[PDB]
Design a protein around this nucleic acid. Structure first.
Lengths: 154, 117, 66
RNA sequence: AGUGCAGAAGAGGAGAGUGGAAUUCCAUGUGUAGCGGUGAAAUGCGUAGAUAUAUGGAGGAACACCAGUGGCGAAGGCGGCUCUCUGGUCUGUAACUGACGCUGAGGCUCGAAAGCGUGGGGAGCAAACAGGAUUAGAUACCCUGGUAGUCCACGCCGUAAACGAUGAGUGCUAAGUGUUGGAGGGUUUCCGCCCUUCAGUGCUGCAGCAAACGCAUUAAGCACUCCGCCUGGGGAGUACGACCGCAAGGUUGAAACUCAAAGGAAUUGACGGGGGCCCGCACAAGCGGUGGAGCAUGUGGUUUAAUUCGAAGCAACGCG
RNA sequence: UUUUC
């Protein structure tokens, strides 16, 4: 906050797949503290992945979270009386966090009444680098370095 | 027309406006733009962002008449006069020399009443 | 202790020696101060009046922009 | 105290001529919907071509860097450059004059800015004045305009926070450290160190003073000479009288009557639309919300033949 | 760098 840095709230991996990234995928989707429904839909979504064109679903998760996950970012700052912006770095933690954030953003309104083939085909097509979320990352890289001009001298 | 292919542009930036005009090698006026000319008002002409978009809107008409390289005249000590140059670099010019000439007198005249605000 | 130019025993500044004169001007064309060049007080004044004579006859420019 | 002999520095003064940059106006080429302005706007200017932009032309004023706790002058003040006339200062020496000195009531001279007369000039700047804004009002601050004046010559007035708020002349009393111009001894290529010695110019400090503040070899210390001035705050630098000025005004200068104070410095607390640092779900990162709908309530309002009474920013409004 | 306490 003001004194300095802080702790990190360490997490524990899955009962089955043993992955903190999928654990973070669980604790992002969980609404109102109901972990049973989120666990059911995530394991059944991996089952749908394993049926049609999927062998190691942790690894197709890792491909999807390669190609949605950024490398740079903007930040709307101010220095002396006007609102500016700057191409900024990103920690590897916030990099995965923003990747999961954008995925679960577009995992909301695909149009399917299945609560998990939106998720399954989301990380499939993100591993296929299609859908809007990989293009969201590409637009983030696009809006980065166009603002390199009025932010390299600050 | 005619592929002029070179020339000198002009930058003039007050504390409440900034204005760009692009000439020939002497030069006659080709096309110009201002922060107010792009539909802005009053206070907001002091931003470096409006300088960017006005300079680029000048370059768009400037290179529709045959133009690759340009030199930069800068009058008007202000704020956005660097963003004008750097967005002038952005949309396809080849700025090769910059002369910032804002002339100092040698104490010939007087400034006005030194304000009380 | 900073070395003034008067190590040579030149008395009259000769009014036109551009080798003896360009040391004290800027690349743009102003006058370099006495603390910058490190000389005595009277030689500062002699060089000042010398190049003020030299600026009129075209032996040196006033303003170097163009 | 002087004068001769020998050197040195300097924006000290008058007269005459000349240079570059900048703002405005004019002429011409390009160029078209804006320019300028402010906390925010608006008056204003632009389609009869502005701003901008390039070339020349006009004219008046001030002199970038050099520039410094530098320098010069009795003070006011003096900084582009060149030439003509010209004042003062400091250093070595003491062959020359043999006390020729200091201070100076009346008198005479000089005197920043504003102001007055007559004739010129007028680029910027801007009292008066006009218009646009803010405010409850704004004859003001802010903005757009705009004259007398600011400049030159020849006269006039003689004033200021003209201040170091510290009169002039002279002798004496620990040091330390920078700078401006000099003059001697040696190391010496010393012209680039150091030691000694004259003056002005800063700063820190001891005896000594002082109400503390502070001053302190450039005394507010120790002493002599000479000159001016003061005696509670108001009434007032006013009235009357006299002299000067074209005029504004200046110099000399009371009393009637009022109050028990008005004052200098130094502490404590408070305060400031003064400042420098630190903290806080105060910001920033995030999660879920309120303001949309409908419903339960507590207020404000309007209404009754009765709307029992309290609670008003944080610290009243599912409060008593 | 808007008035008011």
């Amino acid at each position: 906050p003001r004194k300095g840095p802080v702790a990190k709230r360490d997490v524990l991996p899955d009962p089955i797949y043993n992955s903190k990234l999928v654990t973070r995928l669980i604790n992002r989707v969980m609404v109102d503290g109901k972990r049973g429904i989120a666990a059911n839909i995530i394991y059944n979504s991996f089952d749908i992945i394993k049926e049609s064109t999927g062998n190691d679903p942790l690894e197709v998760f890792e491909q999807a979270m390669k190609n949605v996950m950024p490398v740079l970012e903007v930040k709307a700052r101010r220095v002396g009386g006007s609102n500016y912006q700057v191409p900024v770095e990103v920690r590897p933690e916030r990099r995965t966090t923003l990747g999961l954030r954008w995925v679960v953003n577009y995992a909301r309104l695909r149009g399917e009444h299945t609560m998990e083939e939106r998720l399954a085909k989301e990380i499939m097509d993100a591993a296929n680098n299609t859908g809007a979320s990989v293009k969201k990352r590409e637009d983030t890289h696009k809006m980065a370095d166009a603002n390199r001009a009025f932010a390299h001298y600050r | 027309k005619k592929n002029i292919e070179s020339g000198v542009a002009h930058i003039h930036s007050t504390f409440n406006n900034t204005i760009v005009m692009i000439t020939d090698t002497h030069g006659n006026a080709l096309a110009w733009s201002s922060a107010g000319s792009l539909g802005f008002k009053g206070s907001k002409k002091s931003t470096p962002f409006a300088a960017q978009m006005a300079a680029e809107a000048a370059t768009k008409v400037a290179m529709e008449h045959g133009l690759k390289t340009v030199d930069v005249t800068v009058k008007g000590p202000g704020s956005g006069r660097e963003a004008a140059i750097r967005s002038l670099q952005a949309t396809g010019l080849e700025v090769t020399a910059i002369r910032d000439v804002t002339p100092v007198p040698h104490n010939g005249c007087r400034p006005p009443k030194r304000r009380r605000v | 202790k900073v070395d003034y130019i008067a190590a040579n025993h030149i008395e009259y500044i000769d009014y036109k020696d551009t080798e003896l004169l360009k040391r004290f001007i800027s690349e743009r064309g102003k006058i370099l101060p006495r603390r910058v060049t490190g000389t005595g007080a009277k030689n500062q004044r002699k060089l000042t009046i010398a190049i003020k004579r030299a600026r009129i006859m075209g032996l040196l420019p006033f303003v170097s922009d163009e």
